[model samples]
Target chain A: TGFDRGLEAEKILGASDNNGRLTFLIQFKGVDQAEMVPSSVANEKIPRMVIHFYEERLSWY
Target chain B: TGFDRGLEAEKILGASDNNGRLTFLIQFKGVDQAEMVPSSVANEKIPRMVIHFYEERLS
Candidate 1:
C-alpha cells in the first residue's frame, strides 16, 4: 500500500478549510497513524499553508 | 454551473478504479448534465470522492 497519506490524500483531491485556520478537521484528521503523530507534532509549529505568512517570512523562509 | 463534469471531464482528471468496489466509466457515461440529485440521494450510495470507509459502505 502507499504510505498512509492521511488527510494529505484528501487535500490533494481538494479538501477545504471552511472553519478557522488550525481548527479544521483535516488538520487533526490527516495524521491517522501513530507514526504520523510525531511527524504532525514536530511540524506543528510550521504554518499549514504558505498564505498564512507575511511577505517577510515568505521571503526569509 | 460548477458540476457539469461528465466522463469526458473525468477523463481529463482521472479515471475511477477498474474493480467493482467502484464500477466506473469515469463511473457513469453518456451524460451532458448533472442532477444535483437529492441530498437523500446525495447521501445514498454515492461514489463521490474517496469517501470515508463507512461512506463507501453507504454507497
Candidate 2:
C-alpha cells in the first residue's frame, strides 16, 4: 500500500523552517502515545518522517 | 495560506492509529530541535501534532 493519503485526518499543519525542514501534527489525545510510535525508535534519518498517532513530523532535502 | 500543501516536500508519511488518531513525520535533522518547539511548549492538546523540525513531528 502506497500513495493514498486522506488529508481529512489532519488536526494541525505547519509552516516551513526555511532551513530545509517542515513540521506538522496529526491530532492530540489519541490512542496511547506509544501506539503511534514508529516501527523502530521515535527517531529517523534525514529526509524521513517519524509518526505517532498523537504527534507527527516532516522533513526534506 | 491553508489548502496549499506541497506534498513534494515530504520526507515520509504514516498510517493512522485507528483509535481516533493519526501519526506522521516530516523528516530528520533540520534546524535546532528547539526551533520548531512551537509558540508554546510543543505538548499540544488531544488530536494534536507536536513538531520538532530536526526530529520533525506530525502528531
Candidate 3:
C-alpha cells in the first residue's frame, strides 16, 4: 500500500521568488496525480513538523 | 552561516519512469545554482539518510 487511500502526501520543493514564502507539492497516489499548491492555498493550515521524504523504505536516523 | 560555501544541498524530487531509481537536485547557494543528477550518475555513493529542507529562521 502507498499513501493512505484518501490521504495526501506532500513534499516541500523550496522557497519561491517571493520572500518568506515556500513552495509545496501534493501527491495523490490513488489517482497517480500531483499538483502545486498556490500561494493563497499556502495560507491554509499546514504541517509544522519537519519531514524526510524518501523514495525507498529505510531506517531513518 | 548557510550551507558550507563549498557544500551542496540536495533534495530528492521523485522517481523516474524507470523502476528502482530516483531523481535528485543539487543546490549551491553560493553560486545560486542547481542541477539535476542523471540516472547514470546515481550510484551507491549517495547519502542514504533523509533530510529536512527548511526556509525560516524561527525555531
TM-score of 2: 0.17
Candidate 3: pairs in clash = none
Best of the candidates, TM-score? 3
Candidate 3, residue A23: how far the Cα is off, in Å: 1.8
Better of 1 and 3 by TM-score: 3
Model 1 clash pairs?
Answer: A7-A30, B24-B27, B45-B59
Q: In order of the candidates, what TM-score does chain B achieve?
A: 0.28, 0.23, 0.32
Which tens-of-lDDT digit does each residue in B1-59 have in candidate 3?
Answer: 12323454454443343455445455533446565554334332233312222223211
Candidate 2 C-alpha error for residue A43, in Å: 19
- Number of the top-ranking candidate, with DockQ as the measure: 3
DockQ result, candidate 1: 0.01
Tens-place lDDT per residue, model 2, B1-59, is 00122222223333333344433333333422211122122222211233332344322
**Error in Å for residue A39 of model 2:** 27
Better of 1 and 2 by TM-score: 1
Model 3 per-residue lDDT tens digits across residues A1-61: 1132444545444324356554555554354556565433433323321223223222221
Report every candidate's CA lDDT.
0.27, 0.28, 0.38
